[PDB]
Design an enzyme around this catalytic site. Sequence first.
Site, PDB file in Angstrom:
ATOM      1  N   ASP A  51      -6.132  -3.672  -1.872  1.00  0.00           N
ATOM      2  CA  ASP A  51      -6.002  -2.123  -2.183  1.00  0.00           C
ATOM      3  C   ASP A  51      -4.585  -1.735  -2.530  1.00  0.00           C
ATOM      4  O   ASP A  51      -4.416  -0.736  -3.344  1.00  0.00           O
ATOM      5  CB  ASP A  51      -6.373  -1.585  -0.816  1.00  0.00           C
ATOM      6  CG  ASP A  51      -5.485  -1.744   0.430  1.00  0.00           C
ATOM      7  OD1 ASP A  51      -4.553  -2.706   0.445  1.00  0.00           O
ATOM      8  OD2 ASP A  51      -5.388  -0.640   1.436  1.00  0.00           O
TER       9      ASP A  51
ATOM     10  N   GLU B 152       0.949  -1.101   0.025  1.00  0.00           N
ATOM     11  CA  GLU B 152      -0.086  -0.003   0.022  1.00  0.00           C
ATOM     12  C   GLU B 152       0.705   1.147   0.030  1.00  0.00           C
ATOM     13  O   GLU B 152       0.546   2.236  -0.751  1.00  0.00           O
ATOM     14  CB  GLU B 152      -1.119  -0.134   1.385  1.00  0.00           C
ATOM     15  CG  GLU B 152      -1.759   1.078   1.515  1.00  0.00           C
ATOM     16  CD  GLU B 152      -2.829   1.097   2.576  1.00  0.00           C
ATOM     17  OE1 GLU B 152      -2.349   0.394   3.503  1.00  0.00           O
ATOM     18  OE2 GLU B 152      -3.427   2.075   2.797  1.00  0.00           O
TER      19      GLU B 152
END
Length: 318
Positions: free
Chosen positions: A89, A32
């Site tokens: 994500d 991330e």
Amino acid sequence: AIAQQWAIFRDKYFHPNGRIIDTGNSGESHSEGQGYGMLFSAAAGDQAAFEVIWVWARTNLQHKDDALFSWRYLDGHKPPVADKNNATDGDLLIALALAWAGKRWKRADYIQDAMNIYGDVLKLMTKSVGPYTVLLPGAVGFLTKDTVTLNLSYYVMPSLMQAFALTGDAKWTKVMGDGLQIIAKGRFGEWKLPPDWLSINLHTNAFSIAKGWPPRFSYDAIRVPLYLSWAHMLTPELLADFSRFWNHYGASALPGWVDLTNGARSPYNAPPGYLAVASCTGLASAELPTLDHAPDYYSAALTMLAYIARNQADLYFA
């Protein structure tokens, strides 16, 4: 302005080898975090930084057998990338950044890199659940024979839209549309907020707050209203609900977390990144915080995401 805010972020957290490192958690880099570094540098037009952040992530985190990314590099662990589990994500942020970089710098290889990631997210991280196709948060620890755990903040909606723009695959439309249905239904408590972690029972389709984490709207879920607003998917109903929540507490006292089973709030207040999100989604009266005042890495990254979503410069990568 994005280039000036990126310069602050870069000074604090970027290293010349391409690693993004939180000064308060100095012994790790995450997919991330590399994704944020790539996204912010692409938006700011800093190609020298983008190039090394991507090469580091590809070299150290990208899988051998698929295009997804191990979630963490742990300094001093032998080996440093011992847990191969991914975080969807991170995968989607890296892919969006590669799409933007490939468009703005005319780099067909970056577009291919993005398409390889998106292809494997669609193939490996989607599952049929009741009447939906859902986006799994990772390969391990979220799916059993009885329940699926979803993180609604991993629906990085501008990245899903980019994947559809690149491929024309109607399954991306179904993932996005089912995601909006799931977000509308999976809201809890007196404020009707999404949880950090949602559970769907695979045998009944009943929705609940997932076990295994505190039953809160907090540091994950606060991305949800931002991604929905950024993608122009925030309905009037949902905007009104978020607005009522922000304005009840006010700009000076937004909570860091709210318990969705009893309404309790954290005794402390949220970092400025939450105020950045609230200003984009109904707080009276909305200018963005600046990164020279960011109390920590988490807040700085969330504030930068808000600058990118606001898009004051009206840039569109195509």
